A paper describes a structure:
The SHANK (SH3 and multiple ankyrin repeat domain) protein acts as a scaffolding protein located at excitatory glutamatergic synapses; it plays a crucial role in synapse formation, maintenance, function, and development. As one of the key components of SHANK structures, [name] [Postsynaptic density protein-95(PSD-95)/Discs-large (DLG)/zonula occludens-1(ZO1)] domains are a large class of protein–protein interaction (PPI) modules that are widely conserved from yeast to humans. A canonical [name] domain is usually composed of roughly 90 amino acid residues, consisting of 5–6 β-strands (βA-βF) capped by a short helix αA and a long α-helix αB, where the N- and C-terminal strands βA and βF are in mutual proximity.
To obtain further insight into the molecular basis of the [name]/Ac-EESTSFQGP-NH2 interaction, the co-crystal structure was solved at a resolution of 1.98 Å. The crystals used for structure determination belonged to the trigonal space group P3221. X-ray crystallographic analyses on the [name]/Ac-EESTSFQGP-CONH2 complex identified an asymmetric tetramer with four similar protein-ligand protomers. Overall, the two [name] backbones exhibit extensive overlap with an RSMD of 0.45 Å, with subtle differences within the loops, e.g. Q667-G675PDZ, G680-Q700PDZ, V705-G709PDZ and G748-T748PDZ. Loop flexibility likely contributes to adaptation for binding of the different ligands; comparing the [name]/Ac-EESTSFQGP-NH2 and [name]/GKAP PBM structures, the loops in the Ac-EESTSFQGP-NH2 bound [name] appear slightly extended so as to accommodate the N-terminal acetyl group as well as the C-terminal extended motif [Gln (1) — Gly (2) — Pro (3)] of the internal PBM. Crucially, one of the most obvious features of C-terminal PBM recognition is the insertion of the C-terminal carboxylate group of the residue at P0 into the [name] conserved carboxylate binding loop. Both Phe of the internal ligand and Leu of the C-terminal PBM form hydrogen bonds with three target carboxylate-binding-loop residues, F674PDZ, G675PDZ and F676PDZ, thus contributing significantly to the low-micromolar [name] affinities. Ac-EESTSFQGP-NH2 Glu (-4) and GKAP PBM Ala (-4) interact with Gly680PDZ, whilst the former additionally interacts with Arg736PDZ, which may contribute to the more favourable enthalpic binding for Ac-EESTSFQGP-NH2 compared with GKAP PBM as observed in ITC experiments. Interestingly, Ser(-1) of Ac-EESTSFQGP-NH2 is not involved in interaction and instead Gln (1) compensates by binding to Asp706PDZ — a role fulfilled by Arg(-1) in GKAP PBM.
Residue numbers in the entry:
A (entry chain AAA): 651 to 759
B (entry chain EaE): 1 to 9
The structure:
Amino acid sequence: GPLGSDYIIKEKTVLLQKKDSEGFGFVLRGAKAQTPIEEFTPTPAFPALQYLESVDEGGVAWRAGLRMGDFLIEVNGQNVVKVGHRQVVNMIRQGGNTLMVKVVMVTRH
Amino acid sequence: EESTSFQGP
């Protein structure tokens, strides 16, 4: 609008279950940090540190509804909004062939 | 920032 950006924000909860011989079918990207970044302030347009750089077309993540740009809010019921990249990677790996993730998709109107 | 692929196992 005239006073600033309008956004559609869509929450998605998905449970991925894969073979040992395949990936979840995404690339994760975001801020590194030894412990959770307290100096980061989430905003509706950048609501979390980690997001999906890409999602493999037809892969596990794709089939469940995950898309490029989705921001990671929760991994296996733990909030990761202000959690550094390596810790989130370790949390994804902890479930093995099972990953429960809550994401927010941010689109311009 | 850092990237980690989960495209393969």
